Amino acid sequence: ELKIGVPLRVSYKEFVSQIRGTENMFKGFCIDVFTAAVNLLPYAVPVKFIPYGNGKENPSYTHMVEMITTGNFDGVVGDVAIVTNRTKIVDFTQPYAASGLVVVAPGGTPIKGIESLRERDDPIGYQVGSFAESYLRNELNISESRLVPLGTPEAYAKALKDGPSKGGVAAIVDERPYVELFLSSNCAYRIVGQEFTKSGWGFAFPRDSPLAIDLSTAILELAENGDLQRIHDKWLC
Numbered sequence: 001e002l003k004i005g006v007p008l009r010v011s012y013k014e015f016v017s018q019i020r021g022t023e024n025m026f027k028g029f030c031i032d033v034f035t036a037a038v039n040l041l042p043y044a045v046p047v048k049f050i051p052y053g054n055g056k057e058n059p060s061y062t063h064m065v066e067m068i069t070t071g072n073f074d075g076v077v078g079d080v081a082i083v084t085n086r087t088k089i090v091d092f093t094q095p096y097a098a099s100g101l102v103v104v105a106p107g108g109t110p111i112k113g114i115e116s117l118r119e120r121d122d123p124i125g126y127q128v129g130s131f132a133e134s135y136l137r138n139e140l141n142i143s144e145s146r147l148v149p150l151g152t153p154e155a156y157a158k159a160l161k162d163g164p165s166k167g168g169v170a171a172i173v174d175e176r177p178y179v180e181l182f183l184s185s186n187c188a189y190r191i192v193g194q195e196f197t198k199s200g201w202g203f204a205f206p207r208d209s210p211l212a213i214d215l216s217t218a219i220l221e222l223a224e225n226g227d228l229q230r231i232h233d234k235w236l237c
């Protein structure tokens with residue numbers, strides 16, 4: 001069998017979540033896609049899902065991926081952004097889900113885009129364990145004293161209500177899917193500007209995995225037969 005790493009998410013469980021009272025059993029949008037995908041394969045792929053994470057906070061998805069390279073996982077399935085530093089060390093499938101960083105702020109703030117957020121001094125929220133933190137420090141070079149980790153959508157909504165003047169944030173930077181779910185229950189906020197990364201979600205496998213390529217093709221069949229939008233509709237103003 002394959003030891004497949006699965007992120008142990010504490011928020012936005014609609015994507016990936018451990019079943020309560022199990023350790024190797026998972027449900028969510030990402031699992032269902034992955035299952036469907038393996039079924040279209042011409043051969044059998046036995047998997048054992050292994051949780052990655054302490055169950056208190058969302059794990060570092062980059063460290064989770066690294067476990068493939070240390071030979072601890074034969075692969076990783078979850079809501080994993082295909083980003084450049086990760087692609088350097090493993091082989092992702094093609095994106096089964098489109099994603100990309102956006103700015104979420106209250107309707108009618110002075111913050112209109114990523115650009116206007118950078119030039120200010122005000123604090124920014126990011127999701128705990130997201131590559132977002134790395135991007136904000138290295139590519140956009142925003143000071144670490146401005147970045148505020150946030151574990152849950154409740155945490156999101158609080159830091160936005162509180163605002164900068166009450167140890168909250170002026171805005172949150174996060175991948176659209178999480179943002180879209182958050183806004184379902186919090187219509188008071190909006191995505192200012194456009195998407196400013198095109199990093200999609202994929203399944204991670206060791207460099208030179210025939211699995212990675214064969215599933216990339218599988219994902220396409222699911223998209224053409226409308227099963228991707230079907231599974232989306234089933235899990236996800």
Ligand code: MET
Nearest residue numbers: 058061081128129130131
């Ligand atoms: C805890 S949310 C992190 C998910 C994000 N796609 C990442 O891969 O870093």
Ligand code: NA
Nearest residue numbers: 043044045210
């Ligand atoms: Na084979």
